[PDB]
């Protein structure tokens, strides 16, 4: 059972949880209700396990793609914003959190990956993936490298895999065919092959994870990385002279990043649903609540209409929304966790060499 009279919130460790905790201190000042923000490891896997038994946090934050599986298992409360509140957020962000016709979470912010480059090392970042090998050969002569990003999570390699034709689930005549998966077609194979060749020719290392790529870019050792808005604040601290721009094309086509909508769901087991609604509607989803989280770690393009004038002053956000314009909003169907687990294993096995590209993607299929 979840404790009555207070709020427990889970949010991923790469987000602005200290800023979110400041919104909870404002909530505690006005109402007396303590808000506890936690960032447990693998929380998108832990939440369905503890929530199924009636435990867990009052509120869970994650990108919208996992909430359909949570909703199918009955783990989420249907939210109840009135029409006036719904008119405060962009319509397409409400579409991201609809499952079986119902609203299952509050949209917070729109996220997309961008190419992040060191202007001192690279004033003209490349427009194509194809020219990165020659750039790396040039920078390696100077003790640098061209590109490092997280190869342990398929979210970061998906824009390249999807560029030439790869897809998750086929959508046709108003519904998905969950048996028609596009992880091993010609387009996906071409993208993953290009990634493996970058590794075979030592332009990247298969072991590179989030922490390693972040450290290398923020110390000026690599000229580019691929990351989302949450990472900009640590780059600001390192004083690297960085820019945010469009992901490179592959075979002449734009990279196709999955677009995520950071969203907040209310635990169906929570006895604090009224408090949770008040916190999310009247404290977080305000100009001053989003500002407080953003000052800690940037959210991206926040879903609240009244903030768009402020977003437009941030050129990193326009770049984020240009990459989102060339991408697709993730499905939220329950099969998404199985899709991600399959792509993650295929990328890791191919990049390491234990399997060829054809063998790995055939196993993901």
């Amino acid at each position: 059972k979840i404790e009555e009279g207070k709020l427990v919130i889970w949010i991923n460790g790469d987000k602005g949880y200290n800023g979110l905790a400041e919104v909870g201190k404002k909530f505690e000042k006005d109402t007396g209700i303590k808000v506890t923000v936690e960032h447990p490891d693998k929380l998108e896997e832990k939440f369905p396990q503890v929530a199924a038994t009636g435990d867990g946090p009052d509120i869970i934050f994650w990108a919208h793609d996992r909430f359909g599986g949570y909703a199918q298992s009955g783990l989420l409360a249907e939210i109840t914003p009135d029409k006036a509140f719904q008119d405060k957020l962009y319509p397409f962000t409400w579409d991201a959190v609809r499952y079986n016709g119902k609203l299952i979470a509050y949209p917070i912010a729109v996220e997309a990956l961008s190419l992040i480059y060191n202007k001192d090392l690279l004033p003209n970042p490349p427009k194509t993936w194809e020219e990165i090998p020659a750039l790396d050969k040039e920078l390696k002569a100077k003790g640098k490298s061209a590109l490092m990003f997280n190869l342990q999570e398929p979210y970061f390699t998906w824009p390249l895999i999807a560029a030439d034709g790869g897809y998750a689930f086929k959508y046709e005549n108003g519904k998905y065919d969950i048996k028609d998966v596009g992880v091993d077609n010609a387009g996906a194979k071409a993208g993953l092959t290009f990634l493996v060749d970058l590794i075979k020719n030592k332009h990247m290392n298969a072991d590179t994870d989030y922490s390693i790529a972040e450290a290398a870019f923020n110390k000026g050792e690599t000229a580019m990385t691929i990351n989302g808005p949450w990472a900009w604040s640590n780059i600001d601290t390192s004083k690297v002279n960085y820019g945010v721009t469009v992901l490179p094309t592959f075979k002449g086509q734009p990279s196709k990043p999955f677009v995520g909508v950071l969203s907040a769901g209310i635990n169906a087991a929570s006895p604090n649903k009224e408090l949770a609604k008040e916190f999310l509607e009247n404290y977080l989803l305000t100009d001053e609540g989003l500002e407080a989280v953003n000052k800690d770690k940037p959210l991206g393009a926040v879903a609240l209409k009244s903030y768009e004038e402020e977003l437009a002053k941030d050129p990193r956000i326009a770049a984020t929304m240009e990459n989102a314009q060339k991408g697709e909003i993730m499905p939220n169907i329950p099969q998404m966790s199985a899709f991600w687990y399959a792509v993650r294993t295929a990328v890791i096995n191919a990049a390491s060499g234990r399997q060829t590209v054809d063998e790995a993607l055939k196993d993901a299929q």
Partner: antibody, heavy 128, light 107 residues
């Protein structure tokens, strides 16, 4: 099978009057596309009027027509409509219907793309 | 609001032509460009700021620089004298057209 849109219903109407325009689609299923009405007053630029823009059937309107115009559609007839009430002299224009479609749209109709097929337009004159 | 500039520009066959619209208080990259001849319906040129619509000749291209979106015609052809419109789809699901630009024959 060519995609095309055909507007009808234009004519002369008195100020304060009502007029319903029709947009008949062929060569594609209207229910999987977004449908927009755009008008062009004589000698002037393009002005967007109204849209059905989402999988769930959400509509939006320009401020100058809000409360007076209603956009709707009949899926069984593959036809869209613009009901225009309380008309004014300033509503005189050629009225165009146009479709927006992206083959990768799902339940989310993102990203928003271009208006790729337009009709020939129908002329509405409001005058006494 | 999409501020299109200039309202009219004169050019010759073979010129490189540039038209720019500035978006205000907006972060959308859903920006399209249209061409319209007298008496005819508009025709789509560019969408998503920079994607060339299928069948449109290669001399047409779109780009974004901050809040400014630009249509470029690399080598103006005789059939390219017309009026051009920019258009944005806002995140609030509203459409806005620029005022338009007349490309006319210099003499």
């Amino acid at each position: 099978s060519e995609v095309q849109l055909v507007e009808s219903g234009g004519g002369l109407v008195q100020p304060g009057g009502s007029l319903r325009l029709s947009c008949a689609a062929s060569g594609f299923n209207l229910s999987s596309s977004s449908i927009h009405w755009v008008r062009q007053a004589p000698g002037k630029g393009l002005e967007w009027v109204a849209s059905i823009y989402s999988y769930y059937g959400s509509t939006s309107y320009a401020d100058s027509v809000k409360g007076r115009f209603t956009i709707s559609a009949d899926t069984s007839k593959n036809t869209a409509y613009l009901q225009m009430n309380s008309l004014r002299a300033e509503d005189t224009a050629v009225y165009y219907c146009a479709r927006e479609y992206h083959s990768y749209w799902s339940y989310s109709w993102w990203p928003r793309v271009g208006l790729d097929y337009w009709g020939q337009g129908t002329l509405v004159t409001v005058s006494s | 609001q999409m501020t299109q500039s200039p309202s009219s520009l004169s050019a010759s066959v073979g010129d490189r032509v540039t038209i720019t619209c500035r978006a205000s208080q907006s972060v959308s990259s859903a920006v399209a460009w249209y061409q319209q001849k007298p008496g005819k319906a508009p025709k789509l040129l560019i969408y998503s700021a920079s994607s060339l619509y299928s069948g449109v000749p290669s001399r047409f291209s779109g780009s974004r620089s901050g809040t400014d979106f630009t249509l470029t015609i690399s080598s103006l052809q005789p059939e390219d004298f017309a009026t051009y419109y920019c258009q944005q789809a806002s995140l609030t699901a509203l459409l806005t057209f620029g005022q338009g630009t007349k490309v006319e024959i210099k003499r």
